Paper text:
MAT enzymes (EC 2.5.1.6) catalyse the formation of S-adenosyl-l-methionine (SAMe) from methionine (Met) and adenosine triphosphate (ATP). MATα1 is a liver-specific enzyme that is mainly found in mature hepato­cytes, while MATα2 is expressed in extrahepatic tissues including kidney, brain and heart and also in developing liver cells. The catalytic MAT isoforms are biologically active only when they assemble as a dimer or a tetramer, as the functional active sites are formed at the dimer interface. SAMe is the principal methyl donor in the transmethylation processes of important cellular biomolecules, including DNA, RNA, proteins, neurotransmitters etc..
We report the first crystal structure of human apo MATα1, which was solved at 2.3 Å resolution, revealing a tetrameric assembly. The crystal belonged to space group C2, with 45% solvent content. Each MATα1 subunit consists of 395 residues, within which there are three major regions that are invisible in the electron-density maps of all subunits (chains A–D). The first region is the N-terminal region Met1–Glu15, which has been found to be missing in most reported MAT structures owing to its flexibility. The second region is the gating-loop region, Asp116–Glu127, which has also been found to be flexible in the E. coli MAT (eMAT), rat liver MAT (rMAT) and human MATα1/MATα2 structures. The last invisible region is the Phe250–Ala259 domain, which contains methionine-binding sites located at the dimer interface. In addition, the Asp94–Phe99 domain is absent in chains A and D of the present apo MATα1 structure. In the central region of the wild-type MATα1 dimer the MAT subunits interact through polar contacts, creating a salt bridge between Arg264 of one subunit and Glu57 of the other. Structural comparison of the active-site residues of the SAMe-bound structure and the present apo structure of MATα1 revealed an overall root-mean-square deviation (r.m.s.d.) of 0.687 Å. These two structures align well, except for the active site and the gating-loop regions that adopt the conformations observed in the SAMe-bound structure.
Author numbering:
A (entry chain A): 16 to 93, 97 to 115, 126 to 250, 258 to 395
B (entry chain B): 16 to 116, 127 to 252, 258 to 395
The structure:
Amino acid sequence: GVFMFTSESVGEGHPDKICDQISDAVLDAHLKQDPNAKVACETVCKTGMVLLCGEITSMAMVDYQRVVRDTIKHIGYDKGFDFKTCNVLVALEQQSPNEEDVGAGDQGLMFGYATDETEECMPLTIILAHKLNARMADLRRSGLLPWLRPDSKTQVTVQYMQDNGAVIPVRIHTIVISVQHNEDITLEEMRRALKEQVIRAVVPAKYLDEDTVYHLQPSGRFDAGVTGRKIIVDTYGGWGAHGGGAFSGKDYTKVDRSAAYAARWVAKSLVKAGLCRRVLVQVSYAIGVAEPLSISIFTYGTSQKTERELLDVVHKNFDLRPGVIVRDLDLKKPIYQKTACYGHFGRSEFPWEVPRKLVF
Amino acid sequence: GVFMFTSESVGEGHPDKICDQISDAVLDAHLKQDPNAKVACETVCKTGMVLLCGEITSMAMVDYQRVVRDTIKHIGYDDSAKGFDFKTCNVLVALEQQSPDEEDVGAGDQGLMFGYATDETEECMPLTIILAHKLNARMADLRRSGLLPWLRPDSKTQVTVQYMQDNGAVIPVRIHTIVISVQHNEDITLEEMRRALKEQVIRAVVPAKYLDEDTVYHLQPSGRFVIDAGVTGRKIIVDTYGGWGAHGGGAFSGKDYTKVDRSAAYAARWVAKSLVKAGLCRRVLVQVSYAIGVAEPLSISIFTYGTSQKTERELLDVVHKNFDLRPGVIVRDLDLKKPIYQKTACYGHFGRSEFPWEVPRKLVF
């Protein structure tokens, strides 16, 4: 069985991603001063205008204009947009103010996914898509490709072989890249650079061949942004499943974030321990109940051990009550801005990406 | 194994769904006058302010103010008391509309889509998302009939079903939890509202055999809800399978049929449902992938979760012989130039037998 699979990633300059990142920059700014901060921050933007909405309970003193403007500058708008001159409108309302046995705040359903097909225990499609966009960002920021601007979209299609439930990447079928740019640069120059400096640098040569299709700046030369609208890009690029919960601008008290991270942590640990090549972990929560209602492990036929055996391993090695997760994954730390682009999963610098040694 | 699964739906007055529904009303407005209109209409809304963004190529002459206001009125926001009113709200139209000047037309995007189906309900949809949707529709019915005139348009439901595995199929055993929050008038109490939600909404919609004395009810759980930011394309899971199957990422509303993310998502549903109704499997995830400027799918994968006697390859054979999933032919088979998109924008795009993608095709095999 040969199939093709496509995942997408968007650049830091994509308006939906501007909002995710700004929202998590505000979350971090509070956590730097007050780890017990509660933060629900929704960003909206529309060309020359950024609007922060939501609710905050915190003892931190956060200079919101500085945070937002610093984040816009960091993204690279200094292009249709500028940190020195854009309208930042801060609407959010800051009020002032068991432990491990506090019940879930929502009736949550979350999936965790891992695959052995990459070092990062992630689908090749989504990793390559995120890395291509990061490569462009690196080349733009360093001044090496000065014509690059921060908005971009990349799609990578990988042609796969099935292997009794596992999936083997065989070749790159198609890569699509569009990126915003300055005027003094040709179509041919941009395409040459994208092929040579971005794609060749990111994609293992063994996957590239003479039939790989390249759509580079496909519509020749180059809307509203909101927080929490790039949920497939943020997670597994179409692989596994998604319960619907967005991440950015939600603090650790939101099971949609904290338990999604933990679900990933479990799945990644199961693959790393050699108990399966591929796994979908499904964990459901009841409002006001600490203990999850259920945990389901699906190995796609790639485990010697049974589901129930794996479940017993999960119980022995993990405590997925929200309060314990926050502790074990150190989730009151100001680390969320970094998660808001290039995917929340696959990057080893996050604690949910450091596999737990399993005793079984 | 026993497991619990939760799906969410939101009512017509939830701000994200107000936007989806406005975006698709714009689409329909255009398609009534120009069957070939290209529409990419994004709606934003925040406290008395609706903003239409995006790009339309069309011959249609559309009164945007009227279409937006008719939609808001139809949703049921008709007075300042509700925090929103079709008369007094500002509809800020930012669209740039331009004017213009085959079965083997190429897909406009490098796209991946999933279709999913299951024998657990008559609609071939997961019970969790179907109940969630029907609970919201029931409230909307009782609000419009006058039977519960305290009801207002905005709402959110969650249904947790307890399931049993069955050789890859899933059998619903019971309703574990129901969460309902619905907007309301001032002169009704929480206690009356809860009773009515139990007796007139839940008992009417959810089959008696799934409810028991242990079923948990969280009805108006955050207390009162008398009176917020919305956009198009942020209820992608609510719109589809409610956590089940999988999702490639493509939002539907505000997009004409030439976006494969919409048209092939509907065909993929159609195929999945057709396979289950033919008796070929009890449960199926269909995955279809397209390449820009190529008509034919690159691949079609079919996972039956161990519920088919036929193999993947054999089921692929059946799909090849019964379906033509090129974008141009999809739109012909599913009548996708017809202006019925506003109807898809709440209560889910899948499960409702009034849509062509929900009428199974009789399969030769």
